[PDB]
Amino acid sequence: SLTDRITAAQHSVTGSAVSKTVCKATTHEIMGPKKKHLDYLIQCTNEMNVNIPQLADSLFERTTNSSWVVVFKSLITTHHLMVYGNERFIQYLASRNTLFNLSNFLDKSGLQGYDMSTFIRRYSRYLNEKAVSYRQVAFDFTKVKRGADGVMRTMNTEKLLKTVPIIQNQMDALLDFNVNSNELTNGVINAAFMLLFKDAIRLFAAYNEGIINLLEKYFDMKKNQCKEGLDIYKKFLTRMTRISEFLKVAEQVGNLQSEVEGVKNIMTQNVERILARG
């Protein structure tokens, strides 16, 4: 039967089809991964007959390429699957103990490759942290129910104190991408930035809701919990200027206006409440 399952697998073309599509999503063409290939891979993540770790292996493999174009596109494809694919994909990445290792990545083929290597390294760290965040709390901050009956707003004190700093780590990694509007000049980096922006808006909301919950609980916590809360407030306050810059860039490059306005509004409201306590 194990022998049967193996022989069956040696006659299956599923894995090979998946790998070929990963290659098509990550060609040397300087454009975002094509929608048709991303869609096919999304459907793959819905298929129980698809080997998810093998699909992930193919994406990691493409990140060993020397070309920034191939590497960046593999990161983008991975991100796209984490966001739009079956949740078992990000769940699987969260379960791995080795993720992307692109901290030394440097393509020297020309100025474009050189400039893009910096963003590849930052983006890779963000995707690693996105997986790690899921691993640490066992859910995706950008997917959970929001509002007063939502996850972040209803979380109990002890969990809340452990959870907000994880949101803060994922946020920091996202904010470290740090691209200027005049650097968004090719389809590859633009595709990555669109996904980052989508994550960011949802992440900012989760962060704000965590802060709101803390503010509501503040007068009812133990003393050591208050200390941790204060540490959370202080870190919230110090990232405001970096968050403001992020939203500014997103607007320069063009709900967009609205979703950003609500982030500015709730964040401003939170700042005011925090400063009023101090």
Numbering used by the authors: 5 to 258, 1015 to 1038
What text comes from the article?
Here, we show that the R-SNAREs VAMP8, VAMP3, and VAMP2, which cycle between the plasma membrane and endosomes, bind directly to the ubiquitously expressed, PtdIns4,5P2-binding, endocytic clathrin adaptor CALM/PICALM. X-ray crystallography shows that the N-terminal halves of their SNARE motifs bind the CALMANTH domain as helices in a manner that mimics SNARE complex formation. In this study, we provide structural, biochemical and in vivo data to show that the internalization of VAMP8, and consequently that of the highly related small R-SNAREs, VAMP3 and VAMP2, is mediated by specific, direct interactions between the N-terminal halves of their SNARE motifs and the ANTH (AP180 N-terminal Homology) domain of the endocytic clathrin adaptor CALM. Thus, CALM:R-SNARE interactions ensure that R-SNAREs, required for the fusion of endocytic clathrin-coated vesicles with endosomes and also for subsequent postendosomal trafficking, are sorted into endocytic vesicles.
In an attempt to obtain a structure of a complex between CALMANTH and VAMP8, a construct was designed in which residues 11–41 of VAMP8 were fused through an artificial linker of six residues to residues 1–264 of CALMANTH. The resulting chimeric protein (CALMANTH(1-264):VAMP8(11-41)) crystallized and its 2.0 Å resolution structure (final R/Rfree 0.183/0.199) showed unambiguously that residues 15–38 of VAMP8 form a single α helix with residues between Phe16 and Arg37 contacting CALMANTH, consistent with the truncation data. The VAMP8 helix fitted into the spatially complementary groove of CALMANTH, lined by residues from helix 9 and helix 10, which was blocked by helix 11 in the unliganded CALMANTH structures and by dimerization in CALMANTH(1-264). There was a small movement of helices 9 and 10 with respect to each other that caused a slight widening of the groove as compared with the unliganded domain structure. No electron density was visible for 17 residues that connect the last ordered residue of CALM with the first of VAMP8. This would allow considerable flexibility in the positioning of the VAMP8 and indeed in the crystals where it bound to CALMANTH a VAMP8 SNARE motif could reach an adjacent ANTH domain to which it was not covalently linked. Key residues in the interaction, 13 on VAMP8 and 16 on CALM, are spread throughout the interface between the two proteins. The residues in the CALMANTH:VAMP8 interface are highly conserved from human to fish. The interface is mainly hydrophobic in nature, burying a total of 1500Å2 of accessible surface area, and a full list of interacting residues is given in Figure 5D. The residues Lys24 and Met27 of VAMP8 play key roles in the interaction, explaining their initial identification as residues of importance for VAMP endocytosis (Grote et al., 1995) (Lewis et al., 2000).
